[PDB]
Amino acid sequence: GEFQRKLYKELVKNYNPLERPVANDSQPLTVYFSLSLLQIMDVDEKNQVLTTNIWLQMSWTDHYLQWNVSEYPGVKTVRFPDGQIWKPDILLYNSADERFDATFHTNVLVNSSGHCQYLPPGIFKSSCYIDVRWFPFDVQHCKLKFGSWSYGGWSLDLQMQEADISGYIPNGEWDLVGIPGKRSERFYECCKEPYPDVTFTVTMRRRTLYYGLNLLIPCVLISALALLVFLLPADSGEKISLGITVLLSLTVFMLLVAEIMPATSDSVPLIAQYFASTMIIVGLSVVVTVIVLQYHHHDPDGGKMPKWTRVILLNWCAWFLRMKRPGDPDLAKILEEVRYIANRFRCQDESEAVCSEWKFAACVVDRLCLMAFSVFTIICTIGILMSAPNFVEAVSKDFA
Amino acid sequence: GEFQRKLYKELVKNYNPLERPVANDSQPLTVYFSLSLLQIMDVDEKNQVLTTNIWLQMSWTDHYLQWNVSEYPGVKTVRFPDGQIWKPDILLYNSADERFDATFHTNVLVNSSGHCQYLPPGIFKSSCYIDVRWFPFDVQHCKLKFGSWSYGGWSLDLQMQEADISGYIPNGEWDLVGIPGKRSERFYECCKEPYPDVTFTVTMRRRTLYYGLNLLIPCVLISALALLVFLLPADSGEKISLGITVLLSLTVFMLLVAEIMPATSDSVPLIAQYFASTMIIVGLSVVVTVIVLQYHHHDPDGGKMPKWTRVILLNWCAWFLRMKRPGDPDLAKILEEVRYIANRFRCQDESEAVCSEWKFAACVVDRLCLMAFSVFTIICTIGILMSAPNFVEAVSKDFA
Amino acid sequence: GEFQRKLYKELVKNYNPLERPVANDSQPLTVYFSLSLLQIMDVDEKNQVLTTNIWLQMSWTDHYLQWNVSEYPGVKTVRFPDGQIWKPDILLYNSADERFDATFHTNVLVNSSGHCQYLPPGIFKSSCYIDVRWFPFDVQHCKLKFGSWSYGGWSLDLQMQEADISGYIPNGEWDLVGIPGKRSERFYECCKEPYPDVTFTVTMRRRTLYYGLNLLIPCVLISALALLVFLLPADSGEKISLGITVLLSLTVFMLLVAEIMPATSDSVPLIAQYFASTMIIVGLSVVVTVIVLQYHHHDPDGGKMPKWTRVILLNWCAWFLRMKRPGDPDLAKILEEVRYIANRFRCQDESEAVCSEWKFAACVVDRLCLMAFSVFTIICTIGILMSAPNFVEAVSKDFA
Amino acid sequence: GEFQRKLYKELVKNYNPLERPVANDSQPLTVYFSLSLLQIMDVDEKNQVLTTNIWLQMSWTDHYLQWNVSEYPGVKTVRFPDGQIWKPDILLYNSADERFDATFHTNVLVNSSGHCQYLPPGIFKSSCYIDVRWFPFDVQHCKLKFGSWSYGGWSLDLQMQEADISGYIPNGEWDLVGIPGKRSERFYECCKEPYPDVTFTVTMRRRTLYYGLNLLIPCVLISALALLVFLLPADSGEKISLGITVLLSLTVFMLLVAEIMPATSDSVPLIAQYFASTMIIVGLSVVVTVIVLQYHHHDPDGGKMPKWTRVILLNWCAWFLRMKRPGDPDLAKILEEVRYIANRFRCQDESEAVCSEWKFAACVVDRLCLMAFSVFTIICTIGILMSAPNFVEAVSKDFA
Amino acid sequence: GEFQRKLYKELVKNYNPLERPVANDSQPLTVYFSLSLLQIMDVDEKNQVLTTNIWLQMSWTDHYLQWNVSEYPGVKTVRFPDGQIWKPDILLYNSADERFDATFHTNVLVNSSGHCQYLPPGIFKSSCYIDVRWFPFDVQHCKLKFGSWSYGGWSLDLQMQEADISGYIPNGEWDLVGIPGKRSERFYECCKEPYPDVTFTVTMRRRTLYYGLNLLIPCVLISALALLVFLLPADSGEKISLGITVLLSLTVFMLLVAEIMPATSDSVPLIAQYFASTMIIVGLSVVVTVIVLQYHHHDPDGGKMPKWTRVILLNWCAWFLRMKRPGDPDLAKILEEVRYIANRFRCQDESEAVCSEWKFAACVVDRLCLMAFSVFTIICTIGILMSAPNFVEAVSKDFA
Ligand SMILES: *[C@@H]1O[C@H](CO)[C@@H](O[C@@H]2O[C@H](CO)[C@@H](O)[C@H](O)[C@H]2NC(C)=O)[C@H](O)[C@H]1NC(C)=O
């Protein structure tokens, strides 16, 4: 329309997009900065990069773009594209993107009295420290530091406003706790003028159902199945097979859990501690199994049972678990030969009795070690799992 | 020729690409927004993004771009590139692309009356909630929300035309159900004006043939193979090995499925429920076979058959299972020797009889557990695979 | 020089790089389109995209860039950069690249008569259907569609020239069959004018040496080696281990093909069919192994071999495979002792005779199942691998 | 400075950055081309691409950028960015990059006499055929082709200056053998006009220490350890398990090897034709092991030993292998009893004496197969490894 | 601001950005260079690139941009965007980035006296040599070279200032040692002029609390577990499956290292040689186990046990290890029968004695090899891990 065309013609005349639009040059300009969180796109632990989808919200008061609505009755707002009017150079300080700026430049809406608005969208990839001390029951804080680049404290007075999360889209993996802001002034080696900035901290918790189902239960079940090696009779000859197969099935689980953890050498992750505990438990199980097997296949007439070991295993423990311990010249020549045969059979019987005693000792040792290892694995698993803070709150929220 | 040269020269005289091509500056400019789907490039599970090939469709009216075709014989349309005439700024609200506007800026075709046609293509990536509760029998609703970034409703009212699917090349994985669109107005606290926008919700159904044949069939087959551990006679001495090897080979499939799955924590997918159930079945089979091997290699002496086991295993279950249970002085001296040998044989016969009874008990337990486990695995697999809705429709449309 | 400087100054005076350079503004402008294939660098089956190195080729006639060479001694051609002269807007319709136009922009060579040439290179990513029904004996067709985005047929008409393949660098995986095309004229319900376009279909055939030597051969070898479980005497005690280990190994092997196969439910791939066949074979082999081991460790007391099974396994099949069937009162007390011992030994001999008969039955079953399984696997593998078309052509052109 | 300001103002007066800065418009402009290799970033076998780091060097002469130094005392050189002056358009004819021209555009240095220089750096990706026939002892020849895209031969004649490698940083896994070049001319069917071009063929050799110590040695060690199946006594009962475990480990090893090799079907790579040999060796090892286990667990009732087998195994080989080859009325009732017992014992002795020959035959065949496989695997591996060209040079340089 | 507008119009009147802002035109322009390090985001070893977050600190003096603050009350600074004033060109010479300059072009701050200030951030990807001969106890020195691309020493003398790490953010994987710099010159055969440059060398140390626990502890624990084959009695029958499965489980660590380790061939990494040593130890253990099994299941009637073997094993090793080795005519017919049976038992006893001797020899050789292998493995592990610099520093700084 004629009025809009005339207004656009008049506004740009003798306008310089390089000057700060203030009435008095000494007085700093006031800029209000806020944010509008929409979605946490990704939280990467290996690269420590947080990917978010937010809308910047900055508003100020231009002085030259003021007009009387009487002269132009139709038009009440004017929109200027990028590169025609002055805009604050607010940008992220700790960006991790290949290009340091990741804001899509949109139009700037202008009041009938100079109050400008600017709502650029964009997907921001910032760098924040990720803590894996209590994985996967951890809460992460990541900061977004915004501030003008080449404007001091006496030129651009940066103010702060509360972040808006009304349109937030809930994420499956993480649930948002809050996002408070803070404003501060800083000094730099470059210059002697303070540079204010606005910092937003995003506090989020990790939902633990997926990990608690695919990382903790299967390993516990496999360890419990490894504890069965202390029930197979020695004659089966499969205890070693069972032990090594379990060790392999946990080596592959070690690989799978290592594929995701970052190389941060600052703290030992909870899951790493617990997996290690399972490693040594299974290894000691294999060692005890070897000892038991070497007890069971003890060659008779090649040693004697030590008195201490005998009186311990066959009596003290047997009472403890109430397991009862098992158990004419031709005529003369014929006579002596049958005595020889009978004596051979008697020697065989004595050797069999000694072997039975050795096997019973092996069985008692096996039962004792089963009890000890079972109690040990329960106590260690429970202690490591419950050591982490907020564990009960997290499990209650995620499960019931 | 000279006619279109003169027309192009005179159409840009006192033209501002910053104004709104209206005639009263108090009547909103009507823009008709539509769509044209061509192909679904990708449906990412872990990233929760949707990649589609879309042509937009915008159409409005320009008041200044009008000419009499009588005075310009031959020319009926003109084309203007980007940045030369005013264009509506309509962009995808929810875009998962580092650049927030993935649109190729083509020309604008203008009729003599003044109609402007704009059809920019582009590969759009949008973030939508992907439901995984019913994997792989999935029906997903992903949304596309379009609207003007700056103009409101006093100036631009977005209408709708039905989304067109005519060049849509069918995808080999995702069936297309529909793509409806609704145009809704949203009011603000300030000003009683609408803010129209058009949203399109693509609805796709996942074809299940590939995932079925490659995941469901092999895991069911190996789970059935795990049941064969109940038919191997204990004397073979290789019963544990089959169980552990099956468990390992199936944990491999579990890792694969996990690597395909997202990491959400709002629900337990079907493919996770079924895998966990099969885990439990195989573990219970291993426990049972350890029990049976314990029964089989039972030392005859030093143990007695409990009353309960005697009164159950060999008489009740066998009847319920139709199992038949199997069961001078030199003369004196040589007499004592031969009677000693005979008594030795008598004792051996008694011991082997007791051992045979133990072995029969083991066989009975094997058969009973085989029947029980077969029934339980059939029931569990059928229940889990039939719980999901639209499963009958999925099989009907994919396997036949 | 000076003449070319003067000519450059004269050629751009009153010239609008926005109008179609025609002499009547009512007749179409003839534009010739052609291709030049250089190299095919990636055929991605997962996302069904094709990556090629292509030089376009356009030519037309401009009515404003003409001069008398005799007037400008020495100047015969003039090159204009992008954006300074009118160009046809021909872009590929079905692109799979984030930027819809992945074409480097070069200069336009202009002859003294007004002719223009334009050979812009660029790597094109195109979305085409990749049929996988007959992997890896595969022949693919992928289409490329080029046409004007905005100009119609009253103004622009394309004329095809034959695709040129002279610099085509052969690929190590795909051989080229040809690249034909056809001019097409789309008509509208609008009004009687064509909309010319040129489309090229690239035909390629996968070379099967690598896949034949890396997948089809090792899996056949493993399946054949699984048949050795039928030559292992049961006394070894390591029969089930061999079969289960072979099963585990090949189901691990299946991951390599699983990671290349796309998730298409249109048809069942040939390689997937053949792997499923090998799975059925190995599973049934393990089942038969369990049956044999059951038949071999048979209790001689509780059971007698049925008449039918005897007459089928001991004479009929024995002849059908030509295997022979293997095979004072002190004196009184002494007499009773010795006859007791003799009767005990006689009973032992009868028991071992029955056991030997059972073991022979197991051996006959094992031999018969070996023969049956060998025939079944060879027949199935040959049928599956020969069911594919152009299989003789593939094995004649790749291996030989 | 005033003088340089004046000169900058003068040099652009009436200067069209579109014309060849020649003096006669007839003779061509001689342009000198060269290169400056810095490092070889990566050589990709899978995609057949080469990424490098080079500095293009160009030089020519201008007829308009000349001035008298005595009139501008302080100025000797000037710099013009892209777009102000004429620059030759030289770019790779074979670039495997989405942008067909990856050169960072820097300034142009101009002397007082008019000479110009231009050194744009950039990371160049080129598509060169990469032979793989002799992996890992390989020598590659990748070509870079540079030439003007639009100017011909009467207008712009290239020259060649030998490539410069002085700041070259050696790669960790490639040895630069050289980088020659030569100038070639081409003609069209039009008219006798040379089309000069410059091409560089960088030749590189792969250092093989890492591959030799990572692949060749462990595979050989596993293959050699697979021969230990021929030292195990048959009574251990774990002769099969070692063979199958070796086969499984080497299958996963060959998958690890093949996940990096390109899928080319022009020739069989050395590493593949060596891994196939190892596969065949282990397969026949398992076959022979099955044969031995069949010969050893032979029932001494189902036939005899053929005379041919006797004379070939226990008569000839046993000598050749230098191994020793082992091997009152009641009185009548008592008589019958002892006669029966002794006859049973004699029958048992005959049976075991018969089985001893079968056990010896198994031992002899095992020794013979050990010798055969031990010689054959060594011969095969040494032939395959030493069959490659430049193997002696590779091993000498990379190990001494 | 009226004064701001007036000064902005005044400062760009006849100002050529192409000219150096000096007032003599024959003197160099002093430029102060520095750098501010924020984070070390990535240290890639496979591609040997380093990613850092860096600010530059360019600074110079402009002769033309001076004004009197008295005549412009209030204005103290002005900011110019890219392309409006002269900016020195400083490129990172060794840049492994697709774009040869990944710097965000921010504003230039100018004081009243004319001093400029340019601090453009950007994420840089330098290329450095990653020495890996001491993995994971590693210390690296990547360099960073900066310099003017087209200015020499007569025109631009580049000074240096110390780097700024006051805002450094620690990385969990690397420990920063320091970052020195050196401003050096260079001459040419042309003419005696310097070419100043500033080179920053980044020294970082890897923290090993992660690798030392994930690849150093599990490997040594598995190696120790591999020695249990010398405590397992041979009667078990599972004496070599343990070792072969330990080898199977050990291959995965090699694959993990290969996927982490680069492909360089200039040395052998410490961890690579350590794992090679461990696999050699395990293979030798398997060979020795085969020897023991062969010595244990020895045929008694197969050969006299060698005198050397006696005088070694049964004479010296028994003492050294302190182990004691185990250990009417009717009546005539009756006589003959009992004599036959008695002699049969005598011969059986002799065979048993020989077998027991052989078994004891096997046991003693097993004990001896256990001792030797344990000593060898501890010596090898300690020597390999301690034959590396800064190992004591690494442990005392990380594990404490
Ligand atoms: C300006 O730069 C050019 C660089 O090529 C100079 O040309 C060369 O200068 C050296 C020194 O005398 C001569 O040896 C070469 O023969 C010249 N090259 C050619 C093709 O002639 C040129 O002399 C310089 N001019 C001034 C005034 O410095």
Ligand SMILES: *[C@@H]1O[C@H](CO)[C@@H](O)[C@H](O)[C@H]1NC(C)=O
């Ligand atoms: C701007 O502010 C300062 C301080 O209040 C004042 O001295 C000056 O007069 C103001 N400018 C004008 C034009 O009044």
